[PDB]
Amino acid sequence: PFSVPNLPLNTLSNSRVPSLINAMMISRDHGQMVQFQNGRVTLDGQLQGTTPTSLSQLCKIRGKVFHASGGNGLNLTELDGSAYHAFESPAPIGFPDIGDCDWHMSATATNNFTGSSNEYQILIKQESAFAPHLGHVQADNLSAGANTDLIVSLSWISPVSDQHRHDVDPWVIPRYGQLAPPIYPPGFGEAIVFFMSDFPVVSGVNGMRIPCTLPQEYVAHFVNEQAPTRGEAALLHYVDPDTHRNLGEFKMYPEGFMTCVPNSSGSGPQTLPINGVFTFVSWVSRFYQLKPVGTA
């Protein structure tokens, strides 16, 4: 039988940055199409894009340092050190999927870590030399010796160094060179539900907020259960865990995203409490029409 975790939203992580969920929102501006490569899984538990099972892999890069005149960089591996296969994913698993911005990152030596001299604050730009699908990225302020093995964490993001735009749009994915497919709102006034987390973002279009389509812990749940998809959509109730009151109904599609219908041009799930739990009710057809959620 299909289930979603019996876990309050505000105890779970974003699937695009390692940060607690603190809000739900819908977006007319940005919610017309999304093609996030992280937080992507089918309801029967098929991982897509660069999506890991574990948050320990999310927004991480691993590789060996190269030195070139045009600039230093990393020859990418998987985070466990095994070889990256171009034919399996658009980048190594857990590779950040926030496009068209500067990545400020913290790299540590994986071999004989000595301390401060084996930690490197580096800048990865999304310019010509950014080719994760080919297995290499260019890094600025990377002083480590050639062939040094580094594990790299995303610290913060900021507007592109080359100034071709002055803000960060976290709704866009990188130009990698097997992309998780685009997701569109399915029709009849349904809007994609985005799980929001705060993250250090300089001049973000939505501020210091990062959207995703699934809590990370839902991803691990589907990959574990592998429950057969027995319908066109899973009808969910969002319920108060104390009272067991139905705060609103939502559809989860086999592609592994959620929709609601907002109340007459309203904010939809944005006004709901964030300490609620989603609960599977039943499989429903494409024809099923959701009771509008939230305020006018």
Ligand X SMILES: CC(=O)N[C@H]1[C@H](O[C@H]2[C@@H](O)[C@H](O)[C@@H](CO)O[C@@H]2O)O[C@H](CO)[C@@H](O[C@@H]2O[C@H](CO)[C@H](O)[C@H](O)[C@H]2O)[C@@H]1O
Select from 13, 38, 50, 148 the one that contacts a copy of itself (CB under 8 A). 13
Q: How far apart are CA 222 and CA 179, in angstroms?
A: 20
CA neighbor of 16 nearest in space, from 192, 214, 262: 214
Select from 140, 217, 232, 240 the one that contacts a copy of itself (CB under 8 A). 217
* CB nearer a copy of itself, residue 16 or residue 190: 16
Q: How far apart are CA 264 and CA 244, in angstroms?
A: 26
Please tell me whether residue 42 binds a copy of itself under the rule CB under 8 A: no
**Half-sphere exposure of 232 toward its Cβ, with a 13 Å CA cutoff?**
7
Q: How far is the CB of 202 from ligand X (least distance, A)?
A: 6
Please tell me whether residue 2 binds a copy of itself under the rule CB under 8 A: no
142 binds, among ligand X, a copy of itself, none (CB under 5 to 8 A by kind): none
Please tell me whether residue 106 binds ligand X under the rule CB under 6 A: no
Q: How far is the CB of 178 from a copy of itself (least distance, A)?
A: 18
Candidates 59-67, 81-89, 146-154, 155-163: pick the segment binding ligand X (CB under 6 A).
155-163
Q: How far is the CB of 110 from a copy of itself (least distance, A)?
A: 6
Site string for ligand X, 66-85 (x = CB under 6 A): --------------------
129 binds, among a copy of itself, ligand X, none (CB under 5 to 8 A by kind): none
* CB nearer ligand X, residue 161 or residue 295: 161
Please tell me whether residue 255 binds ligand X under the rule CB under 6 A: no
Please tell me whether residue 160 binds a copy of itself under the rule CB under 8 A: no
Select from 1, 115, 145, 187 the one that contacts ligand X (CB under 6 A). 115
Site string for ligand X, 159-188 (x = CB under 6 A): x-x-x-------------------------
Please tell me whether residue 140 binds a copy of itself under the rule CB under 8 A: no
H/E/C letters for each residue in the chain?
CCCCCCCCHHHCECCCCCCECCEEECCCCCCCCECCCCCCECCCCCECCCCCCCHHHCCEEEEEEECCCCCCEEEEECCCCCCCCCCCCCCCCCCCCCCCCEEEEEEEECCCCCCHHHEEEEEECCCCCCEHHHCEEECECCCCCCCCEEEEEEEEEECCCCCCCCCECCCCCCCCCCCCCCECCCCCCCEECEEEEECCECCECCCCEEEECCCHHHHHHHHHHCCCCCCCEEEEEEECCCCCCEEEEEEEECCCEEEECECCCCCHHHHCCCCCEEEEEEEECCCCCCCCECCC
Select from 16, 19, 36, 139 the one that contacts a copy of itself (CB under 8 A). 19
CA neighbor of 209 nearest in space, from 170, 241, 154: 170
Task: State the residues that interact with ligand X by CB under 6 A.
Answer: 102, 115-116, 123, 158-159, 161, 163, 202
Residues of the shown chain interacting with a copy of itself in the complex, contacts defined by CB under 8 A = 5-7, 10-14, 18-20, 22, 52-57, 79-80, 104, 106, 108-110, 113-116, 118-119, 153, 155-156, 158, 197-198, 200-202, 208, 216-217, 220-221, 223-226
